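User: Predict structure, ligand 2GJ.
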Amino acid sequence: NLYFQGETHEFTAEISQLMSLIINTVYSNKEIFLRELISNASDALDKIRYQALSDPSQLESEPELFIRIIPQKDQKVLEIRDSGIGMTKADLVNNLGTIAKSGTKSFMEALSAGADVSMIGQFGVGFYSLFLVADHVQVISKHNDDEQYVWESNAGGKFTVTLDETNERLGRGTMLRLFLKEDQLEYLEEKRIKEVVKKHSEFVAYPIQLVVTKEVEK
Amino acid sequence: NLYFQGETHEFTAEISQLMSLIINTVYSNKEIFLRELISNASDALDKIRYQALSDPSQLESEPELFIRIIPQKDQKVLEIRDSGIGMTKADLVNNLGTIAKSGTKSFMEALSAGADVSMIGQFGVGFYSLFLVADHVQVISKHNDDEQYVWESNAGGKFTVTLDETNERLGRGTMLRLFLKEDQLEYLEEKRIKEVVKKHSEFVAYPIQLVVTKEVEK
Ligand SMILES: CCNC(=O)c1noc(-c2cc(C(C)C)c(O)cc2O)c1-c1ccc(CN2CCOCC2)cc1
Ligand SMILES: CCNC(=O)c1noc(-c2cc(C(C)C)c(O)cc2O)c1-c1ccc(CN2CCOCC2)cc1
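Assistant: Predicted complex:
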């Protein structure tokens, strides 16, 4: 019996470590990670927007279309949430598999031809750019036709997409939870986040909301 | 400027994690790791034996040719030492790079064609079979023409081959230090090691020594 034929998703976490090494060596300015996450959220928002055009009940799970950035300073986590179409369990497996396969292609090309700062133009590298600032990621998603699921890059053992009985309920859409590297904590600060959004995501056609909790120093 | 072209050694640790996942799924019986380590030691012993044939001073750094297995129960480490030719710093870099490149080939083939228990016949898979029982490895080596060097698969950060100012002095040769998985501690036991050596390494033409420290229970 044969194992792993075509089963690239089984290696998603390992392939991400290869891509993290490449992309962090190539890009010293990490801030483009946020552009890429917002662009992927925008695409998922377009999908629900067009489906709901002929079937508005699809919006009732989360009637507003938005992208929402929530720094969690105590946890050193940056959360990016959208109310896009979301992913069923099978969608999440299939999308991670495609992302993983594109990573193998980008990694093999780096070895054969070398990598430079144009690599951000390659399919899938936008996802891996989250590892410019994060050492670990949780991808949480809720599609109208399925339950809430989560994939954790740091989960020990076999690749798994787990029924989410732990995180807050998304009504619909996707949240990436970025566990930031100790040298990239600037991206938990409101001023820095706003600078990066205005610089790189001006033409995104959805509201980008920033949720900031701070103790009042008295 | 281009990064990583041909620099497969830079990914040795990440490629090993891919190979570890494949080989542990394919092989439920882990014991062949020892056959493969002994076979690589035997090859390095042949090289010093033939060089010393015309230049016996090469043996003076370690005059006996042997393979030596040392369980370190307290550390959950199994050490395999040989008095082979050893590797200079550049040899260790070059051999890890070749091993890493063969891993990329085996991993891509597993995805395209599937992997089965014949994969042990592929170039380089013998090295990766150490991850049947170990989660981490240190490769320590001393060649007559260089200082003692070490590579650590679990060392954080950039691939590096470090001048060894920590471990015991090898006079000449190579030691792999295997940090065993919690479910593979049977391979620290003398009875088990001896069974595996007799079964799989009968035709190795060097003495295989086993060094066992035990408290006398009184
Ligand atoms: C069944 C259809 N479902 C979706 O399209 C969907 N729902 O949520 C998606 C998001 C995925 C990501 C990461 C995992 C790529 C987000 O960061 C944000 C999302 O909303 C998401 C999505 C899926 C794929 C893509 C496009 N690819 C292109 C190649 O790599 C990155 C993503 C963009 C968004
Ligand atoms: C400059 C020449 N130096 C040597 O040949 C040498 N010295 O020490 C060697 C050992 C390497 C390993 C691992 C890292 C492969 C050992 O386990 C034991 C050795 O003695 C070693 C060696 C190097 C290469 C090989 C053969 N390859 C074949 C493909 O993968 C495994 C190793 C076998 C042994």
